[PDB]
Amino acid sequence: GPHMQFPVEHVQLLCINCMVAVGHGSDLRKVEGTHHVNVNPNFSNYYNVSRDPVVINKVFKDWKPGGVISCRNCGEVWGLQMIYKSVKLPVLKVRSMLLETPQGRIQAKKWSRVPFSVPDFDFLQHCAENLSDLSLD
Ligand SMILES: [Zn+2]
Numbered sequence: 017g018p019h020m021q022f023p024v025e026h027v028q029l030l031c032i033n034c035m036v037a038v039g040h041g042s043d044l045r046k047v048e049g050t051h052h053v054n055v056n057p058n059f060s061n062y063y064n065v066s067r068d069p070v071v072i073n074k075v076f077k078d079w080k081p082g083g084v085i086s087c088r089n090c091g092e093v094w095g096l097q098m099i100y101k102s103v104k105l106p107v108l109k110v111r112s113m114l115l116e117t118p119q120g121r122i123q124a125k126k127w128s129r130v131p132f133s134v135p136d137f138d139f140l141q142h143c144a145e146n147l148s149d150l151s152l153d
Contacts, residue, residue, distance in 0.1 A: 020131060022117045027132035029054050030114035032123050034089035038062035041115055041132040045105075048078060052127045052134055053098060053105035054113075063088050063106065065097055072096060087112070103142055 027041030039062065044054030056062070065083030072081050082097030085106050094108035111125040115132060122131055144150050 022115065022119065022122070022131035024132040024134075026117050028114075028116040029108075030116055031087045031090050031092060032112060032114040033092045034087055035114050035116075035121075036089050037116070038087060038089060038113075044134060045137040046127075046134045047098070047100065047105065047137050049136070050078075051095075051098070051107045052110070052130075053107045053137070055103070055105055055137070059106055060104075061088065063094060070096075100137070101139060101143070102146070103137070105137065 024040070024042030028037050029039035029041050029044060030037045039054045039056045039059055043056055044052060046052050063085045065085060069083065070081040071084055075081060079098050079100040082099055082104070084096050085094040085108065086092065087094060092112050094106065094112050096107055098105050098107045109125075110127045110130055111123060115122040115124075115130070117131070124130055127134065
């Protein structure tokens with residue numbers, strides 16, 4: 017029915033091209049609402065960084081560029097890898113990614129249409145998971 021509803025837990029990160037699931041739509045996040053980046057350690061296996069170092073128009077401050085990302089399952093260049101506070105966050109598109117839902121797959125060209133939710137990168141956690149200066153127990 018109406019009320020286009022699609023939970024992240026229901027939305028999986030796949031390759032519109034491949035479509036084998038390169039991640040989860042509930043494992044990705046946003047960065048200062050500038051560019052969506054799906055965080056995942058096993059993602060490095062789902063993509064290969066180009067040879068060249070930085071290949072972008074200009075460089076950013078809030079974060080630095082990385083390497084051109086390309087779905088290893090297929091190759092469809094997602095974009096480039098971005099680092100922030102020492103966090104490898106791949107910057108993919110919305111047209112290169114597929115949102116597998118129990119209501120039907122969805123492929124947008126703008127995250128502005130993304131059905132699932134995309135929370136910003138919780139640095140507090142990543143910091144609490146990278147520092148652990150708080151506690152372990
Ligand atoms: Zn691919």
